[PDB]
Amino acid sequence: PSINISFKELATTVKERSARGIIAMVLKDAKALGLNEIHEKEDIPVDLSAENKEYINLALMGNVNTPNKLLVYVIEGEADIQTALDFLETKEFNYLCMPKAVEADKTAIKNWIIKLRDIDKVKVKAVLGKVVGNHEGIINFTTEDVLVGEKKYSVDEFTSRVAGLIAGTPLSQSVTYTKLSDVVDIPKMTKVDAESRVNKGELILIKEAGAIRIARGVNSLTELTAEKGEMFQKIKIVDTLDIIHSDIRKVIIDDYIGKVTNSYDNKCLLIVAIKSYLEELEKSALIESDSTVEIDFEAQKSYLKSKGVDLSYMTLQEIKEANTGSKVFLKAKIKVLDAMEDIDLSIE
Amino acid sequence: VGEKKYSVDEFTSRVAGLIAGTPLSQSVTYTKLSDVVDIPKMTKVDAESRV
Amino acid sequence: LPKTEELPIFREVAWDFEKDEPILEKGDFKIIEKKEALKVWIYKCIKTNRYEHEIYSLEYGTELSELIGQKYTKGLTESEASRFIKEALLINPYILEVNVKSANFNRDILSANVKVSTIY
Secondary structure: OOOOOOOOOOOOOOOOOOOOOEEEEEEEOOOOOOEEEEOOOOOOOOOOOHHHHHHHHHHHOOOOOOOOEEEEEEEOOOOHHHHHHHHHHHOOOOEEEOOOOOHHHHHHHHHHHHHHHHHHOOOOOEEEOOOOOOOOOEEEOOOOOOEEOOEEOOHHHHHHHHHHHHHOOOOOOOOOOOEEOOOOEOOOOOHHHHHHHHHOOOOOEEEEOOEEEEOOOEOOOOOOOOOOOOHHHEHHHHHHHHHHHHHHHHHHHHHOOOOOOOOHHHHHHHHHHHHHHHHHHHHOOOEOOOOEEEEOHHHHHHHHHHHOOOOOOOOOHHHHHOOOOOOOOEEEEOOEOOOOOOOOOOOO | OOOOOOOHHHHHHHHHHHHHOOOOOOOOOOOOOOOOOOOOOOOHHHHHHHO | OOOOOOOOOOOOOOEOOOOOOEOEEOOEEOOOOOOOHHHHHHHHHHHOOOOOOOOOOOOOOOOHHHHOOOOOOHHHHHHHHHHHHHHHHOOOOOOOOEEEEEEEEEOOEEEEEEEEOOOO
16 A cells, blocks of 8 residues: 655666776785775875885886776786786786786796687787797796886886786777876987887887977787788787777676577677677777678588588578577678877978 | 544445545546545555555 | 856765665765766665655655555556656756656556756
């Protein structure tokens, strides 16, 4: 007999964010020995050391925006790599940095990252000081004797600072020619040496346009295969590709596995949803406005050959109409619309 | 009702007369009685269970 | 010439709207900021009418409970309740406007969709 008006507010977001702006921080301290997720600025645990506090402060600010999420884990230096790997497996991350990453530790980190990206299909990135590895997911910042604010800084400190800055870098903007006001004193380098270092695939600081900025934003991978091409030599392209991969995988796991069945109508609905997501991406300047979603027809051919059904005496549309045995095959045409850093025009 | 003790049948007759005057558009639910002033205190849970 | 001064963040106690009982975080009431205080204010305003309690100010209160008990047909009381909600909710300076979409008729339970526009 007693009834009430129960109204619960609803908020709609046109843009959905997933696995973006994450910073993974692991430091070796004997006092805290735990994980700390920092969502509010100037949140400093008393356990962490002064150098760790400096690392946190460097990670605090970004070029355009403060990084969305800062996650810090603390454990003893001994057996740090195993626990760091376990925790990063437990909780997803976007970028990784280590204050005291030795060459063996950096190699192990790169191997774990590439193994994840190649088997687990988890698109993750790491920033490292001196690594010559053959993967584009890692970031190599080889700039020695770096001093910021008339203060001596180690290589790993500035790599963490640059990772935090990139976390705050918007996708429309490019990391190329981004000046740092805090950096005041750097060893003098020649233009030829800087160009040679950049052509080696290294990220360095240059004094240009009356400021100290980085020359380029290329990936740490020196050797890109024939298929990868020039654009895959840029972190900007791989970033949006990884974001699209993560979003598609997340929505697929949320909706289509288990909950949804396999049918031609289900295939059409999945195609429509993929097209809608691609249109949402097209709303941003990240990708081109033109893209297509199609059923992988040759994959259906291969599935029929595995089944053994003769290809003759039916319409080619029946191949699409034929059930794929709890499977879906799709084809999509996309192109990354990442614009231009430096240009060259002509006069008459 | 009206600081006067009333038997059950008295108030049933009163409620029947009140319902006789209730229009069909209106509903008898949540119809207040000004004459009734003193009633024993009951809990909301007990009233809900009784209803 | 001077621009309008922004309304400072409304801070007060917090609780679950479904629980209807105040919650305590380690002894401290949960802090409400941005779009947290206005929901509590709207819940308090709608839940209880002013005319029942002498303590509240006359401008406070809503007359939606008058429609409780089926005192009139649904067709016009839909718009009447929309107007009542608009009167009851736009009194808050924080809230800009309130919109009501429609009402759903099923058995004895009426479901309606109402919209809130805010500043932050």
